[PDB]
Enzyme design. Sequence first.
Site, PDB file in Angstrom:
ATOM      1  N   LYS A  13       0.806  -1.237   0.000  1.00 54.14           N
ATOM      2  CA  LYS A  13       0.000   0.000   0.000  1.00 54.14           C
ATOM      3  C   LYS A  13       0.831   1.275   0.000  1.00 54.14           C
ATOM      4  CE  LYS A  13      -0.190  -0.494   4.884  1.00 54.14           C
ATOM      5  NZ  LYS A  13      -0.512   0.271   6.104  1.00 54.14           N
ATOM      6  N   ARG A  88      -6.220  -0.097  14.238  1.00 59.11           N
ATOM      7  CA  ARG A  88      -6.061  -1.535  14.069  1.00 59.11           C
ATOM      8  C   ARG A  88      -7.263  -2.301  14.640  1.00 59.11           C
ATOM      9  NH1 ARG A  88      -1.449  -0.627  17.641  1.00 59.11           N
ATOM     10  NH2 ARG A  88      -0.404   1.093  16.538  1.00 59.11           N
ATOM     11  N   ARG A 123      11.905 -14.560  -2.263  1.00 52.49           N
ATOM     12  CA  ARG A 123      12.760 -13.405  -2.046  1.00 52.49           C
ATOM     13  C   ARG A 123      14.115 -13.822  -1.460  1.00 52.49           C
ATOM     14  NH1 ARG A 123       9.931  -8.320   0.214  1.00 52.49           N
ATOM     15  NH2 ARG A 123       9.574  -9.357   2.242  1.00 52.49           N
ATOM     16  N   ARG A 156      15.693 -14.605   4.307  1.00 51.86           N
ATOM     17  CA  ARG A 156      15.464 -14.092   5.651  1.00 51.86           C
ATOM     18  C   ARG A 156      14.514 -14.974   6.457  1.00 51.86           C
ATOM     19  NH1 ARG A 156      15.927  -9.346   5.156  1.00 51.86           N
ATOM     20  NH2 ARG A 156      14.214  -9.185   3.626  1.00 51.86           N
ATOM     21  N   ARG A 167       1.231 -14.301  10.034  1.00 53.49           N
ATOM     22  CA  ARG A 167       0.989 -12.863  10.111  1.00 53.49           C
ATOM     23  C   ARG A 167      -0.349 -12.537   9.446  1.00 53.49           C
ATOM     24  NH1 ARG A 167       6.567 -11.329   8.844  1.00 53.49           N
ATOM     25  NH2 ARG A 167       6.041 -11.408   6.619  1.00 53.49           N
TER      26      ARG A 167
END
Lengths: 214, 214
Positions: A13, A88, A123, A156, A167
């Site tokens: 975003k 949130r 990634r 990572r 998440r």
Amino acid sequence: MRIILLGAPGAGKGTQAQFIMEKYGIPQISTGDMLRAAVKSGSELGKQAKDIMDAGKLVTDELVIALVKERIAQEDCRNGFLLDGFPRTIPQADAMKEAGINVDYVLEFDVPDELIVDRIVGRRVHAPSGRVYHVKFNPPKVEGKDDVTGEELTTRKDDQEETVRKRLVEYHQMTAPLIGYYSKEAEAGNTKYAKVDGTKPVAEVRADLEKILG
Amino acid sequence: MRIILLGAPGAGKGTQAQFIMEKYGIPQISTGDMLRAAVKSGSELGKQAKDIMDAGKLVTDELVIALVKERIAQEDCRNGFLLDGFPRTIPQADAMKEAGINVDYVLEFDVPDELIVDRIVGRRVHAPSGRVYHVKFNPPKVEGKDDVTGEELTTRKDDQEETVRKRLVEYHQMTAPLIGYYSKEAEAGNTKYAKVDGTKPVAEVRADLEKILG
């Protein structure tokens, strides 16, 4: 123009933020920065915040709403503001409305969990420099290797499909009712809510926002 | 010189910090400061911690111990360091040991709850200036009135007796076994633990500290 920009962790975003700032002459606000800054320049609130954080406690929604009402009180927020990822939860949104902090638009930037997972698990990174590469997107000129040093790319701990999928679930169970809260606020006429298909090419998202915001 | 400084909220352990830095040439590290410094200097862990804070999530012990290992690796900690109020639990203390982070001293700055309660509940403040008074210790000239504006004083929410007494119980149930942990360690010869009467004149406490540290 006061805008709330909501989006999944990793949806991208932020790509549309510079555009919004430049179109409307408003700054981007995140509560994380807002907290780091208030503690720095010791103000009553920032002193209350610094204490909680130093004690390893979570900052009360009560403090955060006061720091927001304090921030948006500045010269730079005269034209409005772009509140990035806050609120949130519903009590936070409610607390915002009660303190009289209103927004004109609530933009939900939508990218499917599968696409976010993809954008993240594929990634690679050059550990020693943190230089990023993406197997399908921006691959390293030299396969599996750092074009510069030559040294092999690592992944990572954070970009693990498992961690990424956790998440997301968490984010969604937390954000679902807030989305419902806003859609009704909109039906009520207190704000305007808009979903933005963020799978589109950036130039098309941008055109979509111009149509949505004026 | 590596020292961990413990103390209840309100006891004023900070009073002896400058002395310690000045005597040993070591800096004061506190987790709130450290966190706020990892984010800025976008290092791997700092980025990990910036997101957590930004998402209003609490930093895990694991990430905290990682920032402490990173931090004390800075050259300014070449002489040791003064860790202020951390660890806060046996789980945190045990992890520091496991990561190889030993400490020469663990000082507990002791001030009786009642004395702390008295030092706090009895304080009036001039809200729009921050000036602080204490009905006993530093009363305003015109009691109940701010000396500079002739404006009424108030009591902070934190200063409330109910809030204060709760913070202290909370502190004690949490720190009691850590103190016990550090005494067993002291007896094991792994570190030195010492209790400091914080109810003595700053000049006497300072005198005591020199006879404990050298």
